[PDB]
Chain A
Amino acid sequence: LLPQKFAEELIHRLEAVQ
Chain B
Amino acid sequence: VVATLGQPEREVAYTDIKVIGNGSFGVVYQARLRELVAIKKVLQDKRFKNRELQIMRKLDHCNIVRLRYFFYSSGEELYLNLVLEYVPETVYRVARHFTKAKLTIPILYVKVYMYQLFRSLAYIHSQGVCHRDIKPQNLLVDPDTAVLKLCDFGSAKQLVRGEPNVSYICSRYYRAPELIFGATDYTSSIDVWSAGCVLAELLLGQPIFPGDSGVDQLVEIIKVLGTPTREQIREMNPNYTEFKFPQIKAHPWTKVFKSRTPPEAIALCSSLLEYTPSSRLSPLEACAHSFFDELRCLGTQLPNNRPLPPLFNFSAGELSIQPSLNAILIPPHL
A-B contacts, 25 of them at CB < 8 A, read: A1-B182, A3-B237, A3-B239, A3-B240, A3-B243, A7-B240, A7-B243, A7-B245, A9-B215, A10-B215, A10-B218, A10-B219, A11-B243, A11-B244, A11-B246, A13-B215, A13-B216, A14-B219, A14-B227, A14-B245, A14-B246, A14-B248, A15-B246, A17-B219, A18-B248
Contacts of A3 in B (CB 8 A): 182, 237, 239-240, 243
A12 to B108, CA, bound (A): 42
Residues of B within 8 A of A18 (CB): 246, 248
Chain A contacts for B182, CB-based, 8 A = 1, 3, 6
Say yes or no for B222: interface residue by CB 8 A criterion.
yes
What total of chain B residues lie within 8 Å of the partner, measured CB to CB?
16
B223 on the A face (CB < 8 A): yes
Task: Output the least CB separation between B212 and chain A (Å).
Answer: 11
Contact with A along B182-197 (1 / 0, CB 8 A): 1000000000000000
> Measuring CB to CB, which residues of chain A are less than 8 angstroms from any residue of chain B?
1, 3, 6-7, 9-11, 13-15, 17-18
Quote the shortest CB–CB distance from B225 to chain A (angstroms): 13
How distant is the Cα of A7 from the Cα of B240 in the complex, in angstroms?
8
Which residues of B are found within 8 Å of A7, using beta-carbon distances?
240, 243, 245
4 further A-B pairs in the complex, CB-CB below 8 A; given A14-B219, A14-B246:
A3-B182, A3-B240, A10-B219, A11-B244
CB neighbours (8 Å) of B239 from chain A are 3
In Å, the complex CA distance between A15 and B218 comes to 13
Q: How far is the CB of B273 from chain A (nearest CB, A)?
A: 19
Q: Is the interface of A mostly helix, strand, loop or mixed?
A: helix
Residue of B nearest to A13 (CB): B219
Q: How far is the CB of A11 from chain B (nearest CB, A)?
A: 6
Smallest CB-CB separation from B223: which chain A residue?
Answer: A17
Complex Cα distance A14/B240, Å? Answer: 15
A1 proximity list for chain B (CB < 8 A)? 182
CA distance A10 to B180 in the complex (A): 11
User: With A14-B222, A14-B227, A17-B223 in contact, do A6 and B246 touch (Cβ < 8 Å)?
Assistant: no
What is the CA–CA distance of A10 and B218 in the complex, to the nearest angstrom?
A: 8
CB distance from A9 to the nearest CB of B (A): 5
Which residue of chain B is the closest to A7 with respect to CB atoms?
B243
Q: Which residue of B lies closest to A18 (CB)?
A: B246
Q: Which residues of B contact A6 (CB under 8 A)?
A: 182, 215
What is the CA–CA distance of A15 and B246 in the complex, to the nearest angstrom? 7
Please, how many angstroms separate the alpha-carbon atoms of A6 and B180 in the complex? 10
Q: Which of B227-245 contact A (CB under 8 A)?
A: 227, 237, 239-240, 243-245
Q: B245 contacts which chain A residues (CB < 8 A)?
A: 7, 10-11, 14
Residue in chain A with minimal CB distance to B215 = A9
Question: Chain A residue with minimal CB distance to B247?
Answer: A18
In the complex the two chains form, what is the Cα distance from A18 to B245 in whole Å?
12
CB distance from B248 to the nearest CB of A (A): 6
Q: Smallest CB-CB separation from B246: which chain A residue?
A: A14
- Name the B residues within 8 Å of A17 (CB-CB): 219, 223, 248
Q: Given the complex, which residues of B lie within 8 Å of A15, measured CB to CB?
A: 246
Of A1, A7, A11, the most chain B CB neighbours within 10 A belong to A7
